[PDB]
Amino acid sequence: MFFIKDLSLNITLHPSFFGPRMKQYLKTKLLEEVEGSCTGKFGYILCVLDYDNIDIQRGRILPTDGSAEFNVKYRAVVFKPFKGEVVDGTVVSCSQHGFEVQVGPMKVFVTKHLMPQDLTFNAGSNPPSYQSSEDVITIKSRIRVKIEGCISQVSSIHAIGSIKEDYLGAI
């Protein structure tokens, strides 16, 4: 989940940008290619920590191109998916074979064989919802979901989920 770790990342830059103020330019660069990024190793990368006293300190010019690269060691906040953790995420879109819960970065989906059969599913709902006592997909749609595995692949990350557990699903 929401974790802190030291990360070192290398970035390059075009040789036309060799002006006096390039440290802040590199900083700006580090913000847009750190922000909005999901990797398989560390999940989704949220934002950066410790903006000041950043360490770049040296770069190498490529021999065949004027581009120069720069490694950046930094602290950051990242989300790390895992297996078997009850979370109270929210649902935006639903399907007939199962609702698609959006818990933070993922769209965790529960397939037709993992909803409990004692849940009183109604087909005539817009969106199709699986409600028994209070677990209704709403504008809030807070449903206790457990991600028993987040299947990271070629980078379209999807998590699998289940509500086949007592108090899981219901809120």
Added chain:
Amino acid sequence: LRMKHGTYDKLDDDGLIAPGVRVSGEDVIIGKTTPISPDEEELGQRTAYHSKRDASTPLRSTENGIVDQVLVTTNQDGLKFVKVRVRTTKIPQIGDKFASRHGQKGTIGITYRREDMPFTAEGIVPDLIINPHAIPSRMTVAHLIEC
């Protein structure tokens, strides 16, 4: 099928070129067509453009000249078998290999004209001039006694 850019106007109705006309380097002289029969002959996997897969032979793309005296005669088993001949003048140029009768190979430096050629009392202008330093190294007295 997959036509060249040969500008095929130099051929006639028999698929040959009439002799005596001039040809450039890339120009076509012969024409072929694939006789298979059976391979879904002219309506399969291609447009119409019937059954060419055309392997027409262009001339070698540098030399240019005059075609001359095209003959056609059946081969050993009896087919349509074609030979052509092209005639091309080549005026000597700067880069030709000329040797003596004694091994004085080389090439041609430049050419001037008679208004600055070296010339004698009877005006006998030379045909060609070489370096004396061939002589006392290659030890070719036979060239001099021949002259």
Added chain:
Amino acid sequence: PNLNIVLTCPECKVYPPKIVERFSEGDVVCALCGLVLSDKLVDTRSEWRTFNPLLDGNNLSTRIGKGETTDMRFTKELNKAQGKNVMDKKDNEVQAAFAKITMLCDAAELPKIVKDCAKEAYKLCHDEKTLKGKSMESIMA
């Protein structure tokens, strides 16, 4: 899968496009726009400059023998082993018929076209209940 590449200029789209090939540089250009489509063409003549499968069929014929840097003791084993797979195929009888029609056509001094057309005529049927043997020479005649 449909197994299909179609080439189309991404900026003219008037038809299946009026395109040309520059074999002297091995590239293709839409003649209207003047942009390349693809590069590094493969030659279509140099392989014929480099070096009867329809009558021998899909299975491929192979004669084996001796060389210089080999031994007679095992090339005679090879010469007696070259017939250890002729019974797996009917192509031994196909090539026996091919050899015998070669015997006949060159005996009557018939040319290469007549020889290959007789090869075609055998390869055409080569096996029917109408054929049914019939001395094996009547079919070649």
Added chain:
Amino acid sequence: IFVYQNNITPSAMKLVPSIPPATIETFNEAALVVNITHHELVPKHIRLSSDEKRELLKRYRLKESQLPRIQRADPVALYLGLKRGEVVKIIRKSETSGRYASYRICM
């Protein structure tokens, strides 16, 4: 330090490397009829301390292996009686600077 008149049986040679840390060596008289160093082609040889070897390694930033070798069965090696792990400095009369440093490791 042993000198034999002629050949020695291997049944004597098997217990030659006995009693460590004592070391045993054998020479032939005809192998030592001539002082090999007094030949003018061989350069001067000189021994090192392990301290000096460690100083050399930390100065030239080498690690023990890329340095050029010398065989244990060399005649100058048996002359100096050195064993494995010892470093030999060698000075020869060079023809562009006269005196010239060099180094060998016993292996």
Added chain:
Amino acid sequence: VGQQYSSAPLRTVKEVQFGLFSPEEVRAISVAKIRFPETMDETQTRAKIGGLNDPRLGSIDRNLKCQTCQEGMNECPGHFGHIDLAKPVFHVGFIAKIKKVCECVCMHCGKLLLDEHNELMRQALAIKDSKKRFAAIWTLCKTKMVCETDVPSEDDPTQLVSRGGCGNTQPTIRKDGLKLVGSWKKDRATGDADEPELRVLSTEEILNIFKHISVKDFTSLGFNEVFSRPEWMILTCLPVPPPPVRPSISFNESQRGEDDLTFKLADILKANISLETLEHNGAPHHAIEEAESLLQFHVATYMDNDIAGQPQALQKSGRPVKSIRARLKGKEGRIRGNLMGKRVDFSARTVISGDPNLELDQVGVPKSIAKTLTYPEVVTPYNIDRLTQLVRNGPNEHPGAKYVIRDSGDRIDLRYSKRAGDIQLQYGWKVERHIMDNDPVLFNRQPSLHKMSMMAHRVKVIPYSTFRLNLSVTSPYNADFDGDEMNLHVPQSEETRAELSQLCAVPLQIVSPQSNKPCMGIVQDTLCGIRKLTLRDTFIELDQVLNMLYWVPDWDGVIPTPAIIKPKPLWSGKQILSVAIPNGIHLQRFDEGTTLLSPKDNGMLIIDGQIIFGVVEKKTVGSSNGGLIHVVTREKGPQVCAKLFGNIQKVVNFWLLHNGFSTGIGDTIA
């Protein structure tokens, strides 16, 4: 094109690791499961069957597939499948090592002959290069031809403990043909019982006994566990090569033109399916052994055909089937002829003629070649107008352009280009243009021997198609004008062009490093002419000396004084050559005459760049240890010497014109 740029983080090679393949891993990276020996024309039309030739691997030609990774032809690296085998086979790239290791370890026990109880092999295990340890183990293991469970007597004072596994022997192993046999003497009856049985060493039992070896025994035997374990050394499952390595040549009338490698693989599949059907049905235990021997034979022959010459194993016609050591041998066997040398681009090849008016850093280049070649540039605020004008000049007129490159993967060709006078040529772009003059250019002549033959040059473009160069550099080029041909290359980027300009140009290659003396030189004809000029007895007139003084390009606008005045100004050839010699240069010769009032007129002495006396001769002015060229290059700076050769070459040439010089038979007879 633009080569389909993606977000793969690009870096470089740093390390390479070798090894072998585990059959499970090569099956895991396999995609294809080939069963049909024949490939094309299903029943029998097109679109090759799901056996060979891309069901699900790299595509054939022009097409999508490349197992639907959509990389056409020239972006797909190939894709990989595999084949299964009935029985495991040997391998010709290991046969000797197999014999050594099966001699070494004990079969039926799976334990080493020797384990830390002879001090000799203890120190043999201690020594570690990679393989001299292995050679020691191999020469120690030849004897003690029984494996034992209780060897060690002198590990203890006199006592015996339990070490080994089995009391069996090893059989005496004789290498034979393409297999292995063993004769277990084993001598276990009441008598001596010398009765060995010669049994074929079955690849299954060698595989299983290799599977029963310890990892520490692999480390002792030089097998790295992670990459090299001897069951991988025996072949069970065979990978396939992709269609690019064995390409169909499309043999230009009707054939796809299948080649040697696919041919041999089809033979391998046919033999494998024959063997598996034979063993599946009733095997009479005679044909099955020679059949599996044929399987091993054909996989060995496909592997290489340069084996110990008991077979030859060709395929029709009479040319032998070309295996892989033939593919990768010497003399352009894919390594020397493809990696440390290959074909190139931007190349020229003609025949030279001399010229006395072009200095050393130039070269004469014919204009057809300058039309044919190219060179990329960039678009700056500086080059914009000249580049725009040259683009308007078209692909024909001699400062000409052929290609333009915009921001993306853009190749617009100027030959068709019906929007010709319309492109605005924005910044950040690349254009291709012809060779304008004084571009840096690298030169070659076959065959190269030393640091010479590799000069760089500038260019003055010349008509009347051929090359042209300076008469100076001819002897380090090691080529008279007997028709030899040259080789030319053009750099593409600015780093390369700069380093050619700063390093491989002539004026810092004047002295050869190899011969500790300058190896350039003024040569034969101008040498003879300057010997004619330097003589005391000759002089010269105004109409000459004026013309030579204009002929020197860096003349100061000052005439020298008359040497001798009285009816006529006149000058010495030494006096006029002193103009061409630049200032402040000093030399002494002093050989055998030279008493400062030289009667025999030898020697040479120059003060302040002016000749005083002497006879110019090759042993002073040509290539020598105390050379004049050596002096001026070492002192003044090694590019003024280029103009020095230009000056004295032009002057001696133009004076020799109106002088005239030759020989004849009247020299010879006496």
Added chain:
Amino acid sequence: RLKKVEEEENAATLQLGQEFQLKQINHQGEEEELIALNLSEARLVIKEALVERRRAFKRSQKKETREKELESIDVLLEQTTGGNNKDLKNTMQYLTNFSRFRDQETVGAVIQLLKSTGLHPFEVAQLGSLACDTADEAKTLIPSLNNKISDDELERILKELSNLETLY
């Protein structure tokens, strides 16, 4: 290296990740332990760096209120990056909706308790991420909570953690 299989099921019962070890090394050569962060403190600490980089950008051109924050950092992030981080708006919405304490000082006092107790880091980070109040239903929901920790001690720390947090 030999495919490096290391087959581990990930669970909350000290069944850790393959890369997220307890012990690493850092760039300074010192030992870098594992760092895990709860939902509440993660939402608190992200705003520090957010306002720090916002005033840092304001200085670059020179040279707890969550209803404000959900639109405010949307404006800041669309100022510098694109509008593609609706996913990030959803993650911070998860960070701010279901974290156990809205304010900062209750979480800080919880951390000041935990630095003296010295509990298991991953266990108490999971406890801070989850939002529950009674230990036995927390145990029946999570078998790691069932087996790792005694219920009486879990309850006696759960009440002095749950008194501080703002109830929802």
Added chain:
Amino acid sequence: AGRAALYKEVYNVIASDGSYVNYRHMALLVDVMTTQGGLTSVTRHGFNRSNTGALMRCSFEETVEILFEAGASAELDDCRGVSENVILGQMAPIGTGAFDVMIDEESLVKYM
């Protein structure tokens, strides 16, 4: 004494005619051929059977055998050789390569 005598012999043979070359080239050759504790002819077998990288070792025409031995042994080459950098298509750390080119933001600001 062996490398001194060897250099003397090769100097006599090549100085019999066509002399001369600088001493340093010949001395470099003699000493690199002797610097293994013993004499080593530069053959297919002689210098090549050493702890030397596999790609230079396979550039000398013992190819199929040396690659199979290298695959069996499964060792590494650091690719700091000219042969490896050429056949893998990179600049070798050689001549123009024996160094690297660094960018300094501080020096850029200092000489703005």
Added chain:
Amino acid sequence: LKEKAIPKDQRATTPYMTKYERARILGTRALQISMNAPVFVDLEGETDPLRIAMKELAEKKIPLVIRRYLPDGSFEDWSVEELIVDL
């Protein structure tokens, strides 16, 4: 490991910039003129990027630094300004 560098003092390389890195710095300066990165020496109408680079080196305000290597792996650092272009 142990920072893999050396301070700017006690550098034991030569203080003379030599031919290969000369060629490299001239080539790189041609690349920055090639993609219109700003000039530092004033212009005199010449447009040749090599000439611009030669003039900039001669007036000695090239804003680049250089790193050398040693067989261990540790590196030195130098600016082109504290080097002296002598040859």
Added chain:
Amino acid sequence: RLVKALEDIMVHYDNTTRNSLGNVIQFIYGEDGMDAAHIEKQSLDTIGGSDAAFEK
């Protein structure tokens, strides 16, 4: 054969003579540090003559 024998000999920045692995051959290159260019066959002026002419 010989140009295959001597590929990778590369003088480093420490004036040594190593290979790709780093096997040093000449600790100072060529025993002088002088290149293959600045060389003349000049003479020393000490050996020749007499002791008497030397001190003269």
Added chain:
Amino acid sequence: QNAQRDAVTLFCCLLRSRLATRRVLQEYRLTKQAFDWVLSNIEAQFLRSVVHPGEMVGVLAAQSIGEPATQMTLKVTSGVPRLKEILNVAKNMKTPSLTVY
């Protein structure tokens, strides 16, 4: 320090033999200005005369020793086969000659 002082010993003996005081004052007649000028020029040229780092010295050595082997001749074995036997030992001699003083 020992290597640096040592490796220029031939240079320093030559330099002292050339610039001995009696010889320079009896045949060379310098000024103080010219003396300082010639010292500065000598040291500047020596600093310009160092081995450049990064040369392919063994490759250049190889090509230098390779060039004159094409101009060879063919008693005592000489020429190309003698060179090949010497370079490519071959525990075999064809000329067992030894010199004795």
Added chain:
Amino acid sequence: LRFGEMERDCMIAHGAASFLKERLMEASDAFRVHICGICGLMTVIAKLNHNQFECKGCDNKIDIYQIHIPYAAKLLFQELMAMNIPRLYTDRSRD
């Protein structure tokens, strides 16, 4: 035109190695391949339209690198792994 061994030797003697590199790339193959150094193999498929770089036989989706190479060197490499061989890593690991 043939570029030969001795030509490569004297080019090494000049030491214009960046010229050597750009000649041997741009006047020749100039290829591109994705690999997986966790495999060390050649086999990584690339759905480039969808940025999908699955590694079957290694089932990892992070170890994905592109390098520039000879198609000559790939001909060698795919041939060699057909000949029961070659891992190719991406950084040093020894110092």
